[PDB]
């Protein structure tokens, strides 16, 4: 008696939009779970929003998605990653929280919006997004929330 869409998500810090409970009610007569827009996140850490029509049937989200501090991995081992556009290997908007510059000499982080603007931290995140093949979207300094768009994982 597992989830009717076959979706595996046991980790209590994670959540989905639509919720796992809604997804249980979003299965068609052939067992397929198909949604328009899908978010998976982890409280305190970040979230990944997939626009468009997404087929979630039998996704082991526990195996596939890992949202850690300042890092997301979607498919750990490469052989489990489907072709571009399938499963979760597709365009998405990544939000990572608590992304703040470290003072490696004072070993503490700079988190005030005043200082983040004084040091133009936002432009570092813009360059880092481009460097990694992504498109910078936003930075919310209070929460250190770095948002950027990716074409694949």
């Amino acid at each position, epitope marked *: 008696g597992s989830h009717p869409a076959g979706i595996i998500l046991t980790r209590d810090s994670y959540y989905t939009i639509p919720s796992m409970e809604e997804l249980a009610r979003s299965v068609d007569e052939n067992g397929e779970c198909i949604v328009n827009g899908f978010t998976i996140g982890r409280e305190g850490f970040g979230s990944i929003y997939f626009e468009g029509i997404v087929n979630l049937t039998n996704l082991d989200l526990d195996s596939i998605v890992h949202i850690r501090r*300042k*890092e*997301v*991995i*979607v*498919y*750990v*081992d*490469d*052989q489990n990653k489907p*072709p571009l556009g399938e499963g979760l290997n597709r365009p998405a908007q*990544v939000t*990572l929280d608590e992304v703040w510059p470290i003072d490696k000499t004072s070993r503490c982080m700079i988190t005030s919006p005043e200082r983040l603007s004084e040091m133009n931290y936002k432009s570092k995140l813009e360059n*880092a*997004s*481009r*460097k*990694q*093949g*992504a498109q910078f979207v936003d930075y919310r300094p209070e929460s250190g929330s*770095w948002v*950027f768009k*990716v*074409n*694949h*994982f």
Partner: nanobody, 129 residues
Framework: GQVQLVESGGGLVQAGGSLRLSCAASGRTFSTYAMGWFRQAPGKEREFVSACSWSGGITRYADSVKGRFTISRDNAKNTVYLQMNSLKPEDTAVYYC?????????????????????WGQGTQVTVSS
């Protein structure tokens, strides 16, 4: 130039055979967040081949080499390897090893040449028919 990479092990191999490339990393090697292999064939652009995180726990391969190539690294020796199996003439290229000194915010970062900061000089692989 705070990390230096020197590849070795290139050579001529018959189609279907195997070849293992090596790369020796020097300098501030604990800087590295990722190691990768790229290749450039004559007249074409430099293209992604393979990558792993520093830990070796996450791996990425080009579709063309999935299941034939295996990247690995030895952090006792500060060496990086590319095991190349079932080689084809389309695998003929100069192979470069590269290292990234910043973390991958998302697991697709590994595919991009811009993500890597230090580069070896390359070693030549030639696969005969």
């Amino acid at each position: 130039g705070q990390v230096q990479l020197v590849e070795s092990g290139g050579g001529l191999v018959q189609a279907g055979g195997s070849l293992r490339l090596s790369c020796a990393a020097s300098g501030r090697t604990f800087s590295t967040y990722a190691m990768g292999w790229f290749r450039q064939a004559p007249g074409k652009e430099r293209e992604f081949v393979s990558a792993c995180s520093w830990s070796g726990g996450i791996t990425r391969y080009a579709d063309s080499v999935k299941g034939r190539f295996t990247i690995s690294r030895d952090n006792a020796k500060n060496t990086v390897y590319l095991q190349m199996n079932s080689l084809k003439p389309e695998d003929t290229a100069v192979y470069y090893c590269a290292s990234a000194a910043s973390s991958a915010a998302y697991s697709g970062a590994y595919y991009y040449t811009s993500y890597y900061d230090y580069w070896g000089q390359g070693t030549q692989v030639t696969v005969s028919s």
